[PDB]
Amino acid sequence: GVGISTGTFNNQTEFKFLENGWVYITANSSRLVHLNMPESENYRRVVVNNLDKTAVNGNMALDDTHAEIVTPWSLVDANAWGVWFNPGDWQLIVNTMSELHLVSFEQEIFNVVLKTVSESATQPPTKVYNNDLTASLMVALDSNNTMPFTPAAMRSETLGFYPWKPTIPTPWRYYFQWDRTLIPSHTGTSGTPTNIYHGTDPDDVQFYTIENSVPVHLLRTGDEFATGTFFFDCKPCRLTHTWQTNRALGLPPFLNSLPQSEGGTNFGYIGVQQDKRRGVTQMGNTNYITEATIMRPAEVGYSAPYYSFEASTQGPFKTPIAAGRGGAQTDENQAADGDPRYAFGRQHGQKTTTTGETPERFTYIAHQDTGRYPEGDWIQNINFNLPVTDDNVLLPTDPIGGKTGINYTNIFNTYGPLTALNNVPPVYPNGQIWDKEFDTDLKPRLHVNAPFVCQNNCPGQLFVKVAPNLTNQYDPDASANMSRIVTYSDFWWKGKLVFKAKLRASHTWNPIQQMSINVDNQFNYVPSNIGGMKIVYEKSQLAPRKLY
Amino acid sequence: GVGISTGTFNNQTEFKFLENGWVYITANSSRLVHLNMPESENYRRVVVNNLDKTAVNGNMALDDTHAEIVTPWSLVDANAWGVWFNPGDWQLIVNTMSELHLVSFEQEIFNVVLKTVSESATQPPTKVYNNDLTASLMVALDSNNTMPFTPAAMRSETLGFYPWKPTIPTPWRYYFQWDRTLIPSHTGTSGTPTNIYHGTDPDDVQFYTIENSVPVHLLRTGDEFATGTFFFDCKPCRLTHTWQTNRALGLPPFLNSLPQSEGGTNFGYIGVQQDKRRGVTQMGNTNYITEATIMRPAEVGYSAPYYSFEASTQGPFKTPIAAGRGGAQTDENQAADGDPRYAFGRQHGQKTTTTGETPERFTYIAHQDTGRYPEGDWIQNINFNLPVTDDNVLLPTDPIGGKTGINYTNIFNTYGPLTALNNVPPVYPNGQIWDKEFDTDLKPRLHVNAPFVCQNNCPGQLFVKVAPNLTNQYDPDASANMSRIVTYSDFWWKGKLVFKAKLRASHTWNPIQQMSINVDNQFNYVPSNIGGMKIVYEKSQLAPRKLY
Amino acid sequence: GVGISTGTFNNQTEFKFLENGWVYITANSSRLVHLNMPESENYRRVVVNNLDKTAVNGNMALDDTHAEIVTPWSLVDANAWGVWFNPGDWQLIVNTMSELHLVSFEQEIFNVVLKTVSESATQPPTKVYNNDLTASLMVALDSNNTMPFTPAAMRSETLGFYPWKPTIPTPWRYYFQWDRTLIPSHTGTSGTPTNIYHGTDPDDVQFYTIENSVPVHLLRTGDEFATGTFFFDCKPCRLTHTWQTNRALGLPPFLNSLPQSEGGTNFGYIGVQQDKRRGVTQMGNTNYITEATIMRPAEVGYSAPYYSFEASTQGPFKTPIAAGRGGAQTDENQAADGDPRYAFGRQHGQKTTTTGETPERFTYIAHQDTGRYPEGDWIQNINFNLPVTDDNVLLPTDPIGGKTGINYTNIFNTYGPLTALNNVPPVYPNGQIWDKEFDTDLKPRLHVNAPFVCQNNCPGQLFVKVAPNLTNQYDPDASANMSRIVTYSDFWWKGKLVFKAKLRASHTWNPIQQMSINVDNQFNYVPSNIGGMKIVYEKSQLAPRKLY
Amino acid sequence: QTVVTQEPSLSVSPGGTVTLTCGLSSGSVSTSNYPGWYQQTLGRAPRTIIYRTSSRPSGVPNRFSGSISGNKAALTITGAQPEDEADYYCSLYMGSYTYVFGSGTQLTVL
Amino acid sequence: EVQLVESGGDLVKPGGSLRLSCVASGFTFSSYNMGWVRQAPGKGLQWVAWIYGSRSSTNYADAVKGRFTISRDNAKNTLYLQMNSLRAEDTAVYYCARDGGSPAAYYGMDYWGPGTSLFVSS
């Protein structure tokens, strides 16, 4: 009814420990969600065009041309790690657990409140807010996944990460098909590169509406909505990283001479000439057996063209890579391709008291060593006459195409049947948790944006809207915009995310890396004197595991 | 007890024929294993560094820098074909069988003998050997695979291939994490290329010890150890090779004119103009239908950058390839990338009476025709105007990067969704049998070092050690090395490897290739007048099978 | 028998996780123990007297005068944390667990080997070692605890901390009653202070022998000894520290004015005069209510005379304190009274390759804040007129007894019915695990040397000895020392220590302190290039818990 | 010790083409040396003209071109203007993280 | 945009010490390898010191090894060159140098400061 609550606030994470080292981690997340009535009650097909920016030669990477259907609905998205765990919970998970499973998801809307705003004609602004007890909130659960999948974490538009801070839903929109051509150029190109937007292909048109595709529930102040429990079928997520490169696979060479005194200058020596050694190599025309030429079971990681942009029907897009750059751990400035960069606002980890539109940014460096150091790569002749001469070796400094800033590694691909790689680690708090699998016939082996992928399906998107609150002067025949009473809603969203995790075991004599609070990061986890909070990112795959 | 044997010597291979053309091949292998007490009773973290060798410009491929934990334990490894089969058994297998399955593995240690050495003070050396009836041999079976996987076949350090020749175990060591950077150079580079060893990443440290990870059994002269039967879950291994290239897939063109007289100069002719023919091609802008342009179901084999070295956290390593070079069968000198080269000593096939540290070497040429002949490759313009002109074709002789010894094929990768390839053939006697699968999330489609791969796990590594035999003057507080009575052990190792194989069938009118003894190789299988034995390599995939 | 092993080497720690967040931690510890035949076969009553050292005025704290019974037996003691856990196991325990229980203890001796040494008459030393198959090892388990309790951890004389490093037992001795008087003095005292050793009180004599008090087992090479499982009844041990001082107990004062801008210079203000505030205080003659005078439920910690030496029948001894010094965390140089200092040799954490008799030392700073900062203490008149004047306040700088280096805090005791304190934290690896409770009528509330105390009893001490190996010329009537064949033993000791622990829970938004490997301590957990190992100390009570 | 040799002085008429060369007494200059060319006027700090042997910083006129000629680095000024008269210095990356500088060439526009 | 300003150059007697401070603006200071070059009066440019990487690895020319120390403070966006045992041969104008390639270094001085003169004379 009007004066009866329809739900309870719960934001507790429970760790129920099972037998055999397994734990059920049920994270509860409760938020107060504020929603305004849509700017327009219609669906719009809006073409965003920034040909001015890309008309500058060399700016083709800044292309934003696209077409989107803007809908009157808003999306309630909780597909981010920060929506579910605080730094203490994440510390417990990443320190005491070795693998993580995604078990189930539930969400519900309760304690719906709808208020109308009456603004007076007095010259200084003044307004009052009245409860509209008969107003309704339109809630649609796309449990069949009919609507396009538009996760908000990629735009930093999920629910807020603070239980005590009210959050908002994101206005929903989806991509409409378009055709676009953009010939790349550079500073110094003469003429106007081909840069046109060709329109839309009629055979690819797909105009979706929530009304025609999903059942819609009208919730009054005394109503509540529950989606029901959804159960995932994803793969386990490892909370351990691998450190072994191809150089550290298998049996090391026997050292016939060992150091007689400790110290950094004292080295063990194999004691056998490199061309007189025993072993197996894939180089059938050389007698040298070294750490770089000896046979290994397979290849850890792969090389791909980095900062390569491929053009397709809808324009250019960067070629993704599964693994981050090698050497970003020895030198943090080397983080670039494959090291995801997260930019977020005050709702999602940035200092809440900051002013301005500049977001808080961080580049994530994974502990796994599956990356590549292209500056140390090279190609050489099949003859393999050592030491190699100039014409028989292609080095990373050799120009490709006549460009001194482009080398073969930029266009180099080593993906093959022997490539072995890991899934992307969870990124806390701004990383996505689960992502829908592509509906293609042949599917990618992994996604670079979420550690869990939906093989069959994952829970339907939740859409909310303020039902039209018409005045007495509504005329559907009029071409002017619908006249509505200014209405807004505040409702409580509660979600339950259930994981299954395995407790880690100590395999080595030495201790391992753990996340800990210290003097440097001590104040990143507590509020300031005025209430300013923040959530800094945390690494997940802290403990190491042996690859081979 | 002291005077009671605890096992029997068995080195027989049994072929028990089943119904429906299947045979159980149980190979028994018995060896006398001699073990010396470890040089040191401690674990050492030894850094092998050869910066002197790689400081020579162009010698970066000879990098041996690495770090290893040297343990006081020795590894008993029987993961090689020669440990289980003699040339007659291998001939029977490769001639009468079409596929091979790895069923089970057992090993055991018995008839343990421990002897102490007493050396006299007399000026001419003289010594006696006494049985230490109360001395113990420490045996650890890592059935849980907690320790790093270090197969010895890659170093030619498995058990000997001769039943009547006593063998030794290999001292065990494993790779410790390290960071290394090496900028490639060539003869003619000016300056000192960046060449440093950066140390160890604390987050990747993994110090393993047998004592803290595996149960240890103390075997006295009257004790024996049995691991128990382990059962594999690997894929079948084909003993047949494929000969069909993309040029030999599907229906050949109809010959409207056939030769009227036999002879090498008389050819059949299609009789239709290449641009007037019927068929399907993937080239949508050409009317030519030829043997090189006609559509095929998929691609057999693939091209990859050969003799490409990729650098990662721990230095440079050669990029592996699944298939060997094409044309190595028409010209044995073309064997290079992908054709494994085996180097071994007198225990593993080399003439036992040879003197010197030079190993016996051979490059393996597989009968399967999945390789590539890069000298016959080329790229040309999408326009496809024939005959192609200079600027519209990139040939294998065209310099890439300005280097006349490097062409596009050196950096060329054609692996894709249409690539079809075979697993590596068994290499007798020096090839590995089974290999552990990588613990990565995404796993390689095959391993280039063993025909069988351990999906879940494969039998734990066996470690042996001589238990410390202290003197009366032991003082654990002393910083000097432990003083031990010089002790060594001789024990009998018996293993049983069970395979399941299918008998081959005659599918064609003509006979097929079989391994046979002849005048040229007659004396490669019998001892010399002084007992000198050898085991030359044998090819496995002799018979052909149709790919399509 | 002679050639049959009687046990297995096991040094694995198992973490079997139970329901409701409990885990059984069974630590297995196996060692090779070397024992020499006793220097003397008799019991000796030896008086150690160092009156020369204490005859120097001011050196009374260096008194070592005492009397001990030296026995021909050696003590096998495993009552130290390092005997059971390696740094990885300790990291897991201290990071993932909140409390620890001591469940059970087992120990056993197996694979007994006895060897005689024959030394030749040749001028250059030369000797041989022969197995004495009929020799015996005398093993006595004092399960009834008849013998004096002499834990070896207080002398750094337990078994070694390295599974792969053979260890030794400690020769056993116990205290015999004596009377001693020593009048304290200082540099500048005139005359000879009273310094005498008065002998022994006949009414306190207690001469114990293993033979007359404990059953003795004679173990030959084919025999083994097992003590059987003993079960403890101790209290739980907290793995969390308390941070709340009396200043942080209860409801804080309400701040009527809060800072309007974040920053270290912006403070909240109570906004009420200290003499106009509301609350409860134990000072009935003052209207001031402040953070220092407001009533608290009780007192956390206590003050005691520090570096006070009390003299009793047997001489002077330092007065122990339960808690360490306050401010030792803000300034590590403040660690003194109550902060235990551990000195140990190469068997128990010191770098094994070091040379010399200097031990490795460390002072343990507990994370619990129950200590006192005596420099901030003061006494003042009951009148409490503020600001206090010179004669109405006794400060820590005011001389006591006319000495400018002694103040009231040195003789100050605040222990009372309101005192609340914690048990001592475990000290890894050198700390004792369990300690026998005093047999007094009134027992101490805790022990400062071990976190677990034996209410009724704890497992009997294990004593080992080499049975006399007489020559053919033995004559019991002769007053000369017994002539024995030089004999020694090597036997394997295996122990099982079972704990029950509770997994910790995340109670706060922020993360907590965890033990982690980093660049600074990375090489404290791995061997050097020559095998040099060490075990640095680790803190146990890392996570905080709320006291009130 | 590494020594970088370049013409001590050079001349060019207005609107003409001039080439300044930078070599090594022992060895050859390649793209692995990352030759850099910097321009300095009297009483002013050096100005970067070319980096990575071909890249001129934004604002550098196109008349300056960097290349590798023979076994040396070459800086070509085409249509040289009066303001191009200055001291041009060549920097070679000598591997590891060591840099070497040439003696410098004084280019005067007639 | 990218600006480097050097300061601290002053007359100093032989055998003394001096710390040159370089303030950088218009770019992320910590993301670029920095260095100090020097030009003697009437002489050519000479590389002095280089600081590179997130670990602040340092390399020095043979003429200043053991005597010069190059450091950086990214919080202040400052580069410090501390010279000890100064000689008459160290008298010169010292230029701040910034490499423009953060993830792929140009291995050349992308930006230069105005320079600070240091005179060593008895």
PDB file of C-alpha atoms in Angstrom, chain B residues 112-198:
ATOM      1  CA  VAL B 112      68.093 -51.295  -3.547  1.00  0.00           C
ATOM      2  CA  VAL B 113      71.804 -51.528  -2.729  1.00  0.00           C
ATOM      3  CA  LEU B 114      73.720 -48.840  -0.834  1.00  0.00           C
ATOM      4  CA  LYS B 115      77.517 -48.896  -0.650  1.00  0.00           C
ATOM      5  CA  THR B 116      80.013 -46.700   1.171  1.00  0.00           C
ATOM      6  CA  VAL B 117      83.485 -46.041  -0.234  1.00  0.00           C
ATOM      7  CA  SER B 118      86.555 -46.186   2.015  1.00  0.00           C
ATOM      8  CA  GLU B 119      89.659 -44.602   0.475  1.00  0.00           C
ATOM      9  CA  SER B 120      93.036 -45.477   1.967  1.00  0.00           C
ATOM     10  CA  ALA B 121      95.849 -43.041   2.739  1.00  0.00           C
ATOM     11  CA  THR B 122      98.323 -45.025   0.617  1.00  0.00           C
ATOM     12  CA  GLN B 123     100.026 -42.806  -1.950  1.00  0.00           C
ATOM     13  CA  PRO B 124      98.839 -44.819  -4.987  1.00  0.00           C
ATOM     14  CA  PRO B 125      95.029 -44.631  -4.954  1.00  0.00           C
ATOM     15  CA  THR B 126      93.242 -47.667  -3.540  1.00  0.00           C
ATOM     16  CA  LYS B 127      89.711 -48.001  -2.208  1.00  0.00           C
ATOM     17  CA  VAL B 128      87.169 -50.538  -0.981  1.00  0.00           C
ATOM     18  CA  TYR B 129      83.371 -50.656  -1.175  1.00  0.00           C
ATOM     19  CA  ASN B 130      81.298 -51.871   1.778  1.00  0.00           C
ATOM     20  CA  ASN B 131      77.577 -52.562   1.953  1.00  0.00           C
ATOM     21  CA  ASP B 132      75.768 -50.079   4.209  1.00  0.00           C
ATOM     22  CA  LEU B 133      72.834 -52.273   5.193  1.00  0.00           C
ATOM     23  CA  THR B 134      71.212 -49.529   7.305  1.00  0.00           C
ATOM     24  CA  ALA B 135      71.633 -46.755   4.724  1.00  0.00           C
ATOM     25  CA  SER B 136      68.495 -45.446   3.033  1.00  0.00           C
ATOM     26  CA  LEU B 137      67.439 -44.162  -0.379  1.00  0.00           C
ATOM     27  CA  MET B 138      64.943 -41.287  -0.381  1.00  0.00           C
ATOM     28  CA  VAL B 139      62.242 -41.768  -3.035  1.00  0.00           C
ATOM     29  CA  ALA B 140      59.542 -39.173  -3.719  1.00  0.00           C
ATOM     30  CA  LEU B 141      56.669 -39.639  -6.168  1.00  0.00           C
ATOM     31  CA  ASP B 142      55.054 -36.306  -7.054  1.00  0.00           C
ATOM     32  CA  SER B 143      51.754 -37.933  -7.976  1.00  0.00           C
ATOM     33  CA  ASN B 144      49.980 -34.604  -7.392  1.00  0.00           C
ATOM     34  CA  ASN B 145      52.270 -32.858  -9.925  1.00  0.00           C
ATOM     35  CA  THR B 146      53.092 -30.141  -7.397  1.00  0.00           C
ATOM     36  CA  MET B 147      56.658 -29.755  -8.659  1.00  0.00           C
ATOM     37  CA  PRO B 148      57.510 -28.074 -11.980  1.00  0.00           C
ATOM     38  CA  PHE B 149      57.323 -30.373 -14.996  1.00  0.00           C
ATOM     39  CA  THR B 150      60.874 -30.921 -16.298  1.00  0.00           C
ATOM     40  CA  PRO B 151      60.885 -33.702 -18.912  1.00  0.00           C
ATOM     41  CA  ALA B 152      64.403 -34.992 -19.514  1.00  0.00           C
ATOM     42  CA  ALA B 153      63.984 -35.991 -23.174  1.00  0.00           C
ATOM     43  CA  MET B 154      64.374 -32.350 -24.231  1.00  0.00           C
ATOM     44  CA  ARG B 155      67.876 -32.472 -22.699  1.00  0.00           C
ATOM     45  CA  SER B 156      68.620 -36.081 -23.743  1.00  0.00           C
ATOM     46  CA  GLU B 157      68.714 -37.068 -20.068  1.00  0.00           C
ATOM     47  CA  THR B 158      66.169 -39.886 -19.759  1.00  0.00           C
ATOM     48  CA  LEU B 159      67.109 -43.455 -18.858  1.00  0.00           C
ATOM     49  CA  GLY B 160      69.375 -45.380 -21.193  1.00  0.00           C
ATOM     50  CA  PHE B 161      67.996 -47.196 -24.216  1.00  0.00           C
ATOM     51  CA  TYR B 162      69.874 -50.483 -23.641  1.00  0.00           C
ATOM     52  CA  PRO B 163      68.437 -53.036 -21.171  1.00  0.00           C
ATOM     53  CA  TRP B 164      71.894 -54.512 -20.506  1.00  0.00           C
ATOM     54  CA  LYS B 165      73.609 -51.131 -20.018  1.00  0.00           C
ATOM     55  CA  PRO B 166      73.323 -49.569 -16.536  1.00  0.00           C
ATOM     56  CA  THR B 167      71.913 -46.043 -16.601  1.00  0.00           C
ATOM     57  CA  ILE B 168      71.847 -43.032 -14.279  1.00  0.00           C
ATOM     58  CA  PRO B 169      69.254 -40.481 -13.175  1.00  0.00           C
ATOM     59  CA  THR B 170      69.605 -36.830 -14.051  1.00  0.00           C
ATOM     60  CA  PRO B 171      70.207 -34.245 -11.298  1.00  0.00           C
ATOM     61  CA  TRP B 172      66.980 -32.305 -10.926  1.00  0.00           C
ATOM     62  CA  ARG B 173      66.645 -28.550 -11.341  1.00  0.00           C
ATOM     63  CA  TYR B 174      63.871 -26.147 -12.266  1.00  0.00           C
ATOM     64  CA  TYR B 175      63.516 -22.615 -13.590  1.00  0.00           C
ATOM     65  CA  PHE B 176      63.352 -19.683 -11.173  1.00  0.00           C
ATOM     66  CA  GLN B 177      61.786 -16.446 -12.364  1.00  0.00           C
ATOM     67  CA  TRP B 178      64.058 -13.748 -13.763  1.00  0.00           C
ATOM     68  CA  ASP B 179      63.857 -10.551 -15.806  1.00  0.00           C
ATOM     69  CA  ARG B 180      66.129 -10.019 -18.804  1.00  0.00           C
ATOM     70  CA  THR B 181      66.331  -7.545 -21.690  1.00  0.00           C
ATOM     71  CA  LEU B 182      68.410  -8.009 -24.841  1.00  0.00           C
ATOM     72  CA  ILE B 183      68.167  -5.616 -27.797  1.00  0.00           C
ATOM     73  CA  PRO B 184      69.004  -7.519 -31.012  1.00  0.00           C
ATOM     74  CA  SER B 185      71.894  -6.359 -33.179  1.00  0.00           C
ATOM     75  CA  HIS B 186      73.979  -7.586 -36.112  1.00  0.00           C
ATOM     76  CA  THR B 187      77.549  -7.619 -37.363  1.00  0.00           C
ATOM     77  CA  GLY B 188      77.980  -3.923 -38.154  1.00  0.00           C
ATOM     78  CA  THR B 189      75.859  -2.420 -35.370  1.00  0.00           C
ATOM     79  CA  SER B 190      77.612   0.507 -33.688  1.00  0.00           C
ATOM     80  CA  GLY B 191      77.513   0.862 -29.917  1.00  0.00           C
ATOM     81  CA  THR B 192      76.643  -1.521 -27.114  1.00  0.00           C
ATOM     82  CA  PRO B 193      73.102  -2.941 -27.453  1.00  0.00           C
ATOM     83  CA  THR B 194      71.013  -2.912 -24.287  1.00  0.00           C
ATOM     84  CA  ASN B 195      71.894  -6.194 -22.527  1.00  0.00           C
ATOM     85  CA  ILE B 196      70.996  -6.437 -18.819  1.00  0.00           C
ATOM     86  CA  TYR B 197      69.655  -8.980 -16.339  1.00  0.00           C
ATOM     87  CA  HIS B 198      67.188  -7.144 -14.110  1.00  0.00           C
TER      88      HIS B 198
END
